[PDB]
Amino acid sequence: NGSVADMRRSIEERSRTAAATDKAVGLRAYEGAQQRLAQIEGLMDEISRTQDQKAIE
Amino acid sequence: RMYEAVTGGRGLGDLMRNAQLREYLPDDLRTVYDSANGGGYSGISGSINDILRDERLNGSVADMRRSIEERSRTAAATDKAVGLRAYEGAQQRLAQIEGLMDEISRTQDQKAIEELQARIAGEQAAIQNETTKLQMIAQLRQAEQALISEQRRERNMRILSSGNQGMPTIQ
Amino acid sequence: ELQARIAGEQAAIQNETTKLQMIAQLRQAEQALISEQRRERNMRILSSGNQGMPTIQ
Amino acid sequence: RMYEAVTGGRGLGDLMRNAQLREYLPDDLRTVYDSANGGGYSGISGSINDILRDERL
C-alpha cells in the first residue's frame, strides 16, 4: 500500500533485514550449540562417578 | 543392601537442567523478522543492528568493487575448507564409534555394560550436536551470500542514483 | 550388549547423516567456485587494462 | 559377589574422551569468514589460502 516509492523503501528494508536476521539467528544458535556440547561433556563426566544401578539407569 | 542399590531415587535428572539453552533459538517465528526494530527476538536484535551497520559500504566505488569480489572468492573458499575439515572430523568420529563397539565385546559385569550404553548415548548426543552445528553453518553460508548480493546492489544503486549531480565539464 | 550394539549402529547412521550434510555443503561450494572462475574469465576478456587491437596492414 | 557385580564404578566414560573432535568445526561463527586473512579459524585458514591459489585460471 502507499506510493511506489514507499513500496521500494519497504522492499529494500525487508531484503536487508532478512539477510541480517538470517546471519544473527545462525550466530546465536551456534553459541547455543557450543554450550550444548559443554553440557553433554558434563553429563559424561557424571557417568564416571555412577555407583549403583539405579543411578546409571 | 542390594535392594537399596536397585530401588530409590538418586537425583540424576534435575542435573544440568537450569541451563536455558532454548533461549538461543527464537521463541516464536511470527516476529523473527521484526526483531531489528525492537521486539520479536532480542538476542538477534542487537546482533542485527550491528550487522546492518557493518554491511554498509564506504569509500570509492572501486574499493567497493574490490571488497565485494574479495568477499565472494573468500566465501566460496571458506565453504569448501569448512566442508573438508569437517569431513576429516567425521571420519575420526567413525573410528571412535568403532572403538566403542570394540569395548562392547569385552564388557563383563552389568554395571560395565550399562556405563558403556550411557557412554554411547553421550556419543550419539555429540553427533547430534555436530548435525545442528552443520545446519547452522549452512544457514550462515546462505546469509553470507545474501549479504554479498545486498552489497552488490548497494554499489549498483550508488552508481545509478538519481541524486547524483555531476557531469563532465567542457574546457 | 545388543542394546549397546544397536546404539552404536545409530551412532554410525548419525555419522553418515553428518557426512551427507558435509557433501551437500561441498557441492554448493564447488558450484560457487565454478561461477567464480566463469566471472574471472569474463573479467579477463573485458578488462579495461587491455591495450591491443587489430592492425591495418 | 553379585552385589559387587552390580554396584561400583567401572571407568567406562572417560573412555576415548581426549579426542578433541570439536576442533574440526569452527569455534565461533562471527569470524569464520575472516579466517583467510588470519585469525578466525586457523585450521581452515591454511586450506583457504591453498584453495584460492588453486582456483586462479
Numbering used by the authors:
A (entry chain C): 116 to 172
B (entry chain D): 59 to 229
C (entry chain E): 173 to 229
D (entry chain E): 59 to 115
Please give sentences taken from the publication describing this entry:
Conjugative type IV secretion systems (T4SS) mediate bacterial conjugation, a process that enables the unidirectional exchange of genetic materials between a donor and a recipient bacterial cell. Bacterial conjugation is the primary means by which antibiotic resistance genes spread among bacterial populations. The recent cryo-electron microscopy (cryo-EM) structure of the conjugative Type 4 Secretion System (T4SS) encoded by the plasmid R388 revealed that the remaining VirB proteins form a large assembly organised into four sub-complexes: the outer membrane core complex (OMCC), the stalk, the arches and the inner membrane complex (IMC). Previously, we solved the cryo-electron microscopy (cryo-EM) structure of a conjugative T4SS. In this article, based on additional data, we present a more complete T4SS cryo-EM structure than that published earlier.
